[PDB]
Write a protein that binds this ligand. Structure first.
Ligand code: CL
Lengths: 443, 442
């Protein structure tokens, strides 16, 4: 088509997309239609002459919508990794219409500047800033896997220069075999991957009761490993674990890493966004010790998933995505972004409130952010049983996890549209099905 | 923001995009801005309260628009890695709203691959409509698709020699594996070889830059006689350098009787086989094991579009199939064929201006959409020309080396290149040519 054809249909699509996102409350979260349903609803060959815009859209409703998940719904109570906000859409449209540094000066320079905005919001210490401070600085990365690996490698080269200056006899090959990296037991798998690819030994540190790495567990490991003749050169401290909202004590672990020449990489994951809010910055005291810091701004700052921000204490050791950041940050503002996260933590506690009040359910981990780790008091069996009925119903979606030897339900409030109305309706549904589940147990 | 806000600014953005696209002739193809122009124009911190959409777009015009390469420009006469049409834009808006990475994903894929298969008049072997084993999938890029092929081949050959000799270890077999491609073949092949950890050898092309039966078999014998093991082989229709075509009918029977996986890469020109005039160049696919090309290049799908069929599926992220569906229904087979033919035509228009002129020469046969031309004389003269051109900033070309000869390429692959753009450009070449000829005299 030509341009002013596109003015019309584009403006129509805006409308279709608007309505979907308004009435999405009514859609069923999981597709209630079976593999193979689609072939016989559509012509076996392409049309010769163009179909109308009018007829295509209707097919979108009638043929496409039934066969789609609709993750964007308030009742999808898990993290939706490819979610996008409205500003992110607006940007996407433009980012598409445009399509190295020398290729795109703006794309590159915007990245550096947005990194600084992000920086300040989180109030990282000043060394981290790209603001021509000439020390530290940050970068966007494809994944939080990339990021962990980058710091790992940087960590490894560093230790080999320092150990080989020490004794010019030792080979790089001899050193590498002794290298050990650490992470909590609730470490993201992206740590294992990193260490695997970087060719070193990865060991878990036992988490404390609240699933935080607590130094005594770290120090022992250190002692056990320095004494078997291994070498510790790197470690991931996770803030906001993906299992639950667990936070590694940075204030105890940091000081140790400094003293033992262990590179400190802080994986804040998703939770990191929450440090734009003062109530949470205390979970981030200790960053002073870290050598790198990485988080995904997608879940709470509404930015494109494509983007994983990472900073470093020294720059020497180390798609048009900055445009969306720019839009989203500009269109919500820090306060809006703040109000956004805050609105979710409050629904998250609201839900916790509901679970405490019922004596058949327990809470497993202190509820700090959006997610609530709960379960039905009794066997893992009972609970496996219960998750099954919820998904079988196709009214809400929940994912589980295991803490220790315990099966857990994760209720996570991340969607842009969620209200306490939905949380209420979600609880009660869970409530009812738990009654039916409970009957069955006794048989 | 909220829904109804999207409504207002969603529409304004529609407009903004229209204008840009309408007034794209006015832009300069490559941004001309100094290192570090942006920062001073952006504030030091994020705003505390929301800015205005008015102020945001204004800043796109002022701050962003000078610092971007305008790839859509009809004057950007190189291959643009993103072909963006208007229906493609519309599916993006919907894929936006129904996040994807669901029975409708997998199924609309299978069906559009059958659609595209039927348009390319592929053997039924490669279609799943018949209920045959053959079927198609959509990949990220050709470089991925080529890798997915190679691996599938390495697996196959491994499971096959180990079936005949259980004492043989994967390790020992890999050491001897050999894959091949034309000496015009896209790097995406060398890269795949490094990841796949097999040896890669190049087959010498002919007068027309085509891989032929003689050279290929020469190579295999050489390498079999070394005790190496051929397993994979890449045939290229529409090469990167000059748009040449490996001889598929010659080469396909060889691979079969040599028990070699035949992957047929047509990344660029694959789209034109939906025209009956060009389908012959795809003859021999019958012999292939996997065929691949990029429609996002020339059929007006958005960039993350790749397509690859295999005869055997058991040999083998985004909602890409909704963008194809949209494009196809909005253009219809006719309209697409038309789009392809228009390019070819202005390609041939440019060819005959250059022949019309006695100071130039054509280097390779002008099959479809790319023209490889040259100022008569020394490479040196020709490097000057591209240096004017590229300096001028009026139009932009990417050259290449065909064997020894320096060659200027001229791609017509833009949604809105018209007959006029081709003449305004050729005038601008001749001007600069006469100059470079004047400096040759001194
Ligand atoms: Cl989180």
């Amino acid at each position: 088509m030509n341009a002013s054809e596109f003015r019309r249909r584009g403006k129509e699509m805006v409308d279709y997309v608007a309505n979907y996102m308004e009435g999405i409350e009514g859609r069923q979260v999981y597709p209630d239609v079976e593999p193979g349903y689609l072939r016989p609803l559509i012509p076996a060959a392409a049309p010769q002459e163009p179909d109308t815009f009018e007829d295509i859209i209707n097919d979108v409703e009638k043929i496409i919508m039934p066969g789609v998940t609709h993750w964007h719904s308030p009742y999808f109570f898990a993290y939706f990794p490819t979610a996008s906000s409205y500003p992110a859409m607006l940007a996407d449209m433009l980012c598409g219409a445009i399509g190295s540094w020398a290729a795109s000066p703006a794309c590159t320079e915007l990245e550096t500047v947005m990194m600084d905005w992000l920086g300040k919001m989180l109030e990282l210490p000043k060394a981290f800033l790209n603001e021509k401070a000439g020390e530290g600085g940050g970068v966007i990365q494809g994944s939080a896997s990339e990021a962990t690996l980058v710091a790992l490698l940087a960590a490894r080269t560093k230790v080999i220069h320092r150990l080989q200056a020490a004794s010019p006899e030792l080979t790089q090959a001899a050193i590498m075999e002794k290298l050990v990296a650490y992470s909590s037991d609730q470490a993201h798998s992206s740590v294992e991957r990193a260490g695997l690819i970087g060719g070193v030994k990865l060991k878990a540190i036992p988490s404390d009761g609240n699933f935080a790495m607590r130094a005594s567990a770290l120090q022992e490991a250190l002692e056990r490993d320095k004494a078997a003749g291994l070498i510790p050169f790197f470690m991931v401290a996770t803030l906001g674990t993906t299992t639950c909202c667990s936070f590694d004590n940075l204030l105890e672990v940091g000081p140790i890493c400094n003293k033992e020449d262990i590179w400190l990489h802080v994986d804040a994951a998703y939770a990191g966004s929450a440090f734009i809010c003062p109530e949470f910055r205390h979970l981030l005291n200790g960053v002073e010790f870290a050598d790198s810091f990485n988080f995904n701004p997608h879940k709470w700052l509404l930015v494109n998933f494509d983007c994983s921000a990472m900073w470093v204490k020294k720059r020497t050791d180390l798609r048009f995505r900055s445009l969306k950041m720019w839009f989203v940050f500009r269109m919500y503002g820090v306060k809006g972004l703040q109000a956004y996260i805050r609105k979710h933590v409050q629904l998250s506690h609201e839900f916790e409130s509901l679970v405490r009040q019922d004596p058949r359910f327990e809470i497993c981990v202190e509820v700090i952010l959006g997610l609530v780790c709960f379960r039905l008091k009794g066997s893992n069996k009972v609970n496996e049983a219960l998750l099954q009925r919820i998904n079988s119903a196709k009214k809400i979606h929940l994912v589980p996890c295991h803490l220790r030897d315990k099966f857990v339900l994760r209720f996570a409030i991340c969607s842009r549209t969620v209200e306490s109305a939905h949380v209420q309706r979600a609880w009660e549904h869970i409530k009812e099905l738990a009654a039916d589940v409970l009957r069955a147990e006794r048989e």
